[PDB]
Enzyme design. Structure first.
Site, mmCIF file in Angstrom:
data_model
loop_
_atom_site.group_PDB
_atom_site.id
_atom_site.type_symbol
_atom_site.label_atom_id
_atom_site.label_comp_id
_atom_site.label_asym_id
_atom_site.label_seq_id
_atom_site.Cartn_x
_atom_site.Cartn_y
_atom_site.Cartn_z
ATOM 1 N N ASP B 38 -69.895 23.766 -23.486
ATOM 2 C CA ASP B 38 -70.264 22.416 -23.877
ATOM 3 C C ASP B 38 -69.107 21.584 -24.455
ATOM 4 O OD1 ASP B 38 -70.406 24.267 -26.103
ATOM 5 O OD2 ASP B 38 -71.485 22.701 -27.243
ATOM 6 N N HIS B 243 -42.162 23.504 -12.629
ATOM 7 C CA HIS B 243 -43.217 23.106 -13.588
ATOM 8 C C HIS B 243 -43.666 24.343 -14.392
ATOM 9 C CE1 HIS B 243 -42.742 19.482 -11.473
ATOM 10 N NE2 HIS B 243 -43.836 19.472 -10.731
ATOM 11 N N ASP B 260 -38.892 19.091 -20.216
ATOM 12 C CA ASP B 260 -39.418 17.949 -19.481
ATOM 13 C C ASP B 260 -40.719 17.568 -20.172
ATOM 14 O OD1 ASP B 260 -40.228 15.977 -17.639
ATOM 15 O OD2 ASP B 260 -39.678 17.184 -15.900
ATOM 16 N N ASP B 271 -41.312 9.888 -19.165
ATOM 17 C CA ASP B 271 -40.976 11.074 -18.396
ATOM 18 C C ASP B 271 -39.473 11.370 -18.519
ATOM 19 O OD1 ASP B 271 -40.729 13.169 -16.598
ATOM 20 O OD2 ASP B 271 -41.437 11.970 -14.857
ATOM 21 N N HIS B 350 -36.100 19.099 -4.855
ATOM 22 C CA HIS B 350 -37.083 18.061 -5.083
ATOM 23 C C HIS B 350 -36.479 16.684 -4.939
ATOM 24 C CE1 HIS B 350 -35.629 17.315 -9.219
ATOM 25 N NE2 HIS B 350 -35.602 18.627 -9.377
ATOM 26 N N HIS B 354 -39.283 9.231 -8.565
ATOM 27 C CA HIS B 354 -40.645 8.823 -8.258
ATOM 28 C C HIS B 354 -40.969 7.581 -9.087
ATOM 29 C CE1 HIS B 354 -42.089 10.475 -12.082
ATOM 30 N NE2 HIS B 354 -41.330 11.521 -11.808
ATOM 31 N N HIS B 361 -46.583 10.314 -11.819
ATOM 32 C CA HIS B 361 -46.230 10.104 -10.410
ATOM 33 C C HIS B 361 -47.003 8.892 -9.958
ATOM 34 C CE1 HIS B 361 -45.289 14.637 -10.227
ATOM 35 N NE2 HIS B 361 -44.261 13.946 -10.687
ATOM 36 N N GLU B 383 -33.893 11.829 -11.622
ATOM 37 C CA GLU B 383 -33.975 13.199 -12.106
ATOM 38 C C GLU B 383 -33.302 14.232 -11.193
ATOM 39 O OE1 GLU B 383 -38.018 14.914 -12.334
ATOM 40 O OE2 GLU B 383 -38.732 12.984 -11.578
ATOM 41 N N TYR B 387 -30.820 24.286 -9.667
ATOM 42 C CA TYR B 387 -31.507 25.493 -10.103
ATOM 43 C C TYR B 387 -30.948 26.663 -9.307
ATOM 44 C CZ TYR B 387 -34.312 21.405 -11.009
ATOM 45 O OH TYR B 387 -34.730 20.136 -11.366
ATOM 46 N N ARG B 404 -31.982 20.112 -15.251
ATOM 47 C CA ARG B 404 -32.381 18.787 -14.825
ATOM 48 C C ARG B 404 -32.141 17.802 -15.956
ATOM 49 N NH1 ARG B 404 -36.972 20.190 -13.312
ATOM 50 N NH2 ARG B 404 -38.504 19.550 -14.843
ATOM 51 N N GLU B 406 -33.188 13.733 -16.684
ATOM 52 C CA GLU B 406 -34.073 12.702 -16.152
ATOM 53 C C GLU B 406 -34.227 11.545 -17.124
ATOM 54 O OE1 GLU B 406 -38.112 14.082 -15.679
ATOM 55 O OE2 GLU B 406 -38.598 12.433 -14.318
HETATM 56 MN MN MN Z 1 -40.129 14.951 -15.723
HETATM 57 MN MN MN Z 2 -40.329 12.887 -13.180
#
Ligand code: MN
Ligand code: MN
Ligand code: CL
Ligand code: CL
Ligand code: CL
Ligand code: CL
Ligand code: MN
Ligand code: MN
Ligand code: MN
Ligand code: MN
Ligand code: MN
Ligand code: MN
Lengths: 440, 440, 440, 440
Positions: B38, B243, B260, B271, B350, B354, B361, B383, B387, B404, B406
């Site tokens: 619930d 991620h 991130d 972001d 990647h 974006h 996104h 970004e 890797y 990374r 960004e």
């Molecule tokens: Mn990010």
């Molecule tokens: Mn991003």
């Protein structure tokens, strides 16, 4: 403290012991949940699936097969290892590592569930399935049974009996193991530290959501990343709204703030409410209402033990409340007559106690009016409150006061253990704590 | 900074201007979402519904009726005021207050939607509906149309044309108003302060989730209660998982940590990614990879402007990466040949950028290979990353390095504005910041 | 002959006797079915619902409640009486007349099923439900159970066990009462008269569908309005198509016609196949194939008795077929080797026998390879056939010949009774019948 | 008379002419329909699918692609040829033969529809789809659109506009070609011969269903295998039930019988009602009611022409009825006042006329109160009736009398053509016909 592999295995065996020979139990993982567009909420495993696995992935199904009274085995369906998905979204247990990691006999790819499930159910008498829990799970089970029903030419037969395992499993969850109690004890301590912190940080002019931030930071630092429910920080009139979660208002000098917040630690919920003056000092009116709620809680804490019930203890609380409200002129009349007409209900409109565990409102049968006799190993909250609406027909000084005070307890052989008494609740102790913090 | 009533009204009128005469657009609120049993997740309004309303309740539907080219009006369906629900779960706008609060012409109870919607659609030529977005909304719309199709004896007629408004609305969202840019600027600043804090707090032996807690506390204190996506804190080999959200490991002296994280402020996403040494000092190998990613970002920041594209800037980044990787011996061969075989892809897999807005996104057409020509008012991320897997066939010292970096930018008439440059990214500035914090 | 109220009541009691105490069985009527637009097919009641009621209305549900081992009662949900619906679409039984008419204890309006069903299931241990049979029924049952599961505050409890009653009920249907056998006997006689008529009316140049019309007219005149399955009239090469129902071709002098047709009389199926020369005279080639199929049938009719099985009798038929086909040069080799390689299967590709009753392919467990031992009261077809494709690699004169001959039988204590022997099948008797009709 | 390949092609082109450039229309076949268990009803193709194809298989979809204003092409999805399915269940057109047989440009296997449909819709602006017609079709279309919406990385785009083609197509169907009129003329003649036969065969003591059998036999012998709707044979009080289809009663000397029956010939419906005395002679009371209904019909037949409407002709009928009922004492009062209070409605409670074609209640817009102006090529029924309930408060001799008389007409340039006047309706002609048959 945590729950280990061996305990998850014990729980699986205890279910199997309750199963009919020639049967299989199917326990499904929670679906992932969209927050917005392509973003998902942080994953929360289904509590019953968690209870039997401690496994925090979606697209997984635990199948316990009881072939007969001596022979049984387990099969897990779970996501395959996959280089790309894993570089992107994270590591997966996979099939090779699952049997040892989780202590299951076999593991198969979730992608093969429709090709394999019907073969596992073929020829069994009973399937245990929590029908209606998840649509995706219902589709899978119904498809498998349909294949079997329609497959007599392939010598397939469907089990004719489907039993909801939830009643049995929820009765299991109602009684905590010593290890579960240790986890809940830690949850209570983490939650208590958070509430203490909130009291020490609170100042007039801060926003309600500032105390939420303090609380969640404290949860996190002890390894409880997520709250067990949405945090309530209700200052002033917002305290009279039971699940006020907007937490959007500036906290005013002269108002109380009611904080209801609890961590989720290794799956288990804490659940504490404390109400205190934003400026560190109760007004006379605030103190007068507070004392009635505190008396209700202290009395409940003395009483809760094996052999009583939530219903019985609730009756004592109701008398305390009616008595105190008459004394303040909030209610008028004869106490016993007022009790007989449930005259407290405009001010105390919820239950005193709910079970606590892997869900904050935990599973388990309460009995009619929560009359079930308490036994050792049950874990419950104790949360009396009084809420006087801004427009209530009562002496003006009480209007807009919302107070709840909530502790979490475990029933023991000798009474109860309070898991959350490490955050103060006596008004003089609250004021002392806040006076000390306010001096720096 | 926020978006006001008048701006939501402007957006509604701008949609109406694009609508055919004799038409209605239907915009539905997000359903509430179960976390466990619930308990529900904190509510997140549907981004498109939000875009036209700033209204954060479920069980609401905005109906914009364009009767003809001069006459149009709006109707909101929303939850009724109700004493009990409100004492329990919180305040509701209701029907009386909605027209003034939201700037709609009329408000009706959501409970009456099936009795009223078909009457609003009767005799129109076109219905604008995001079919497939929500099951509950599809059921409501399909029921209304079916009533109309089947109601000729009652002189009812259904619109024969249904148009998905998402392409039009998402093109609207792609171009930010100055007010939206101000909100995003604040989101970027809040997010940057969080990342600075994480760098200043980070020490070997802390858990990844500790930095998540610092970050979320900083979001909260600036009034951004929730992150715009699940925070990633990837130390060591976890940095090579794009991620990684488990954030469960102890951060080791000698490893990098990739963070991130982004806030959600008045609906809008920050972001930011920063990668830095857990112990405050890049190793030579770490620095060598870092410099290539930073060069990629700095070059991209110089280039992004009206008239270029994500595709064009990506080509420049790819050359920078291939060049740097050849120089370090991670790639071997002729740079141009390597570029022609997309040899960077095992290490940079990647997209560079974006769109950013009400979703991290964000909506809007990219063109083939993100070739759409950039114009002022578009908001995007930049970004680049590299890797190097723990088992990559590369010089040993680079294995297990995930970096990374960004930033979030807005395209302006003269180039771009960097909304997140207030958190450092030059390696010497990162080390200086961490050295200072580490001294206390 | 029919099935009366008292027999439907006996069947209900026999189910109840097999039910657990503290249980309810739910039996749902068939939905009405659209033929085109607003026109529906003539209503066909669900066979199991029919079996317990003889009631030919939709929107009806039979509920049998077994409170304990001595006390049980029945409730029918059915359409209310309503002046207008009835002036339009016909008379309805209603609630007042149902208890006496059908012999149920109580009747309630179908419109109240969702308000009443959960109250009937409250507190029971078991619900018997044919899950997956009808979507509308599943929705009703699932809703009721969900109300109960979620209604503990109202002191409601759901039965945890759901049992598919189909296995038990279908085993009941497999064994016919003497009254059922009388009905089937009449079905067989009506069907036989139809097939005789078709043989007497058939002439070259008539269309296949003309014999269908003769057949259906004969069904109708004996009070069997509808066929039990779609009539097959396969002349020439169409005889080699097993369920050829187009019946669209002109019947040619020199071809055989295979007619498979059966009436539905008081719910029960006839099922007869006869194959005969369109011009009244078998060619030598036709006769050669015919004799093998007839020998197969005559032998099967001698053999079928308690203690044998469809599988055992099928083996005898296979030997007869392989032997005859070798003799004609259609198969080549050693009979026993050919049998061992199932060499008959290109020409006899279906089962010899299926159960017969309220469905033409009646319910009931066959055992693996139809090996179940036959007992008195079982009703089955006997339908050997040989189908030689137009392009089969066989002596040319046999190509395009499709022959099946099918009778319906009841297993008795002493063997079987043939319910359909009143239409001729010996080739000389077929020719004599047709010669006589052809003379006028 | 039939509709040929070239006409189906003309209809396809006429739809395409009405389509937007950059669009596709999707027309789906009817699903097969279960009668009981594994037995299906005889297949009835969806009328709109039929209209464009004359193709009588399920699992088929017609796709008309209009690439631009000069270029268009058609694709059929249909069942593959398959040896086994075909030996069992019958021949299938398949992909090789379909283009020539049906006159479509291309044919693909239905099994590939999900792999191919989205590719056909990719990049179009508009999809024409009858949403809500069939669940299976909606699933297919929604899946295709979802693939496109979600496939921007594959350079896919979904059409944003969906238009229901039913309004356009149904307007096409409302106006019959000369070939369609020829088919309907034949349907009317076949149906009329059936009704004549019923009158000639009817005797007291026969069951209502006996006349149904005569009728259906006559349909069949002219190549109309199936009725266009369920046959009504309502004798005595059953005549007052509008869609009485039980046809279960013995027809009594002294009662009327109302027969409403129509064939389906090449997809097109006949629809005739005749009412006549079971014993061949109208009583005075029966004749008195009959004459009013016949006057209503004869007047309607004189009036129907281009430029009038069903509403206008209905007004004339209402006056005729009120006048006649006053004259007999069934109604009492002033005719004009009675008309103004719709006093006829207890006795004439349905519409005078409906469109007729591929459905008996054919498609096409009627206008408010059926006020649409009639034009040549429209086909409609004319079916006045009077139904005096057994318990009506009227002179006793009229109670239980139900009479309808229905013809099918085509509007022509000069008035109308009656397609069903070859079965008698003047009472003296009915009696003469029956007297002649009754003498043998
Ligand atoms: Mn990010
Ligand atoms: Mn991003
Ligand atoms: Cl998988
Ligand atoms: Cl509401
Ligand atoms: Cl009803
Ligand atoms: Cl196919
Ligand atoms: Mn609480
Ligand atoms: Mn609580
Ligand atoms: Mn048969
Ligand atoms: Mn058969
Ligand atoms: Mn009719
Ligand atoms: Mn009609």
């Amino acid at each position: 403290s945590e729950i280990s592999r061996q305990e998850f295995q014990r729980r699986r065996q205890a279910l199997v012991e309750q199963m009919q020979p020639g049967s299989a139990a199917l326990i499904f993982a929670a679906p992932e949940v969209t927050r917005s567009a392509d973003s998902e909420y942080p994953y929360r495993q289904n509590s019953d699936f968690w209870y039997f696995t401690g496994f925090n992935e979606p697209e997984a199904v635990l199948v316990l097969i009881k072939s007969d009274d001596t022979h049984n085995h387990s099969v897990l369906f779970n996501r395959v290892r996959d280089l790309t998905a894993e570089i992107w979204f994270g590591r997966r247990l996979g099939q090779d590592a699952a049997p040892e990691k989780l202590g299951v006999d076999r593991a198969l790819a979730f992608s093969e569930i429709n090709q394999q499930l019907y073969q596992l159910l073929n020829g069994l008498d009973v399937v245990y399935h929590a029908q209606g829990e998840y649509a995706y799970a219902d589709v899978i089970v119904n498809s498998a049974l349909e294949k079997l029903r329609k497959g007599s030419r392939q010598n397939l037969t469907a089990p004719a009996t489907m039993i909801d395992w939830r009643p049995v499993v929820h009765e299991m969850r109602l009684f905590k193991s010593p290890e579960e109690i240790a986890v809940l004890r830690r949850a209570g301590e983490i939650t208590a530290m958070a509430h203490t912190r909130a009291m020490e940080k609170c100042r007039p002019g801060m926003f309600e959501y500032h105390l939420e931030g303090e609380i969640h930071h404290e949860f996190n630092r002890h390894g409880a990343r997520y709250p067990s429910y949405n945090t309530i920080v209700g200052s002033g009139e917002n305290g009279c709204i039971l699940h006020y979660t907007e937490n959007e208002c500036e906290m005013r000098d002269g108002d109380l703030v009611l904080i209801d917040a609890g961590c989720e630690y290794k799956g288990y919920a804490g659940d504490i409410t404390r109400t205190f003056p934003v400026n560190g000092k109760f007004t006379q009116a605030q103190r007068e209402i507070y004392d009635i709620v505190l008396e209700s809680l202290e009395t409940s804490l003395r009483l809760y033990r094996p052999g009583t019930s939530i219903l019985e203890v609730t009756g004592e609380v109701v008398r305390i409340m009616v008595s105190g409200l008459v004394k303040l002129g909030i209610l008028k009349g004869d106490v016993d007559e007022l009790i007989a007409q449930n005259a407290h209900r405009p001010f105390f409109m919820h239950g005193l106690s709910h079970w606590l565990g892997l869900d904050v409102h935990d599973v388990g049968v309460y009995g009619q009016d929560r009359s079930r006799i308490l036994e050792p190993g049950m874990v419950l909250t104790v949360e009396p409150g009084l809420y006087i609406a801004p427009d209530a027909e009562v002496p003006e000084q009480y209007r807009g006061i919302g107070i709840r005070i909530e502790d979490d307890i475990v029933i023991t052989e000798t009474g109860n253990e309070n898991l959350t008494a490490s955050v103060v609740k006596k008004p003089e102790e609250i004021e002392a704590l806040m006076v000390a913090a306010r001096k720096q």
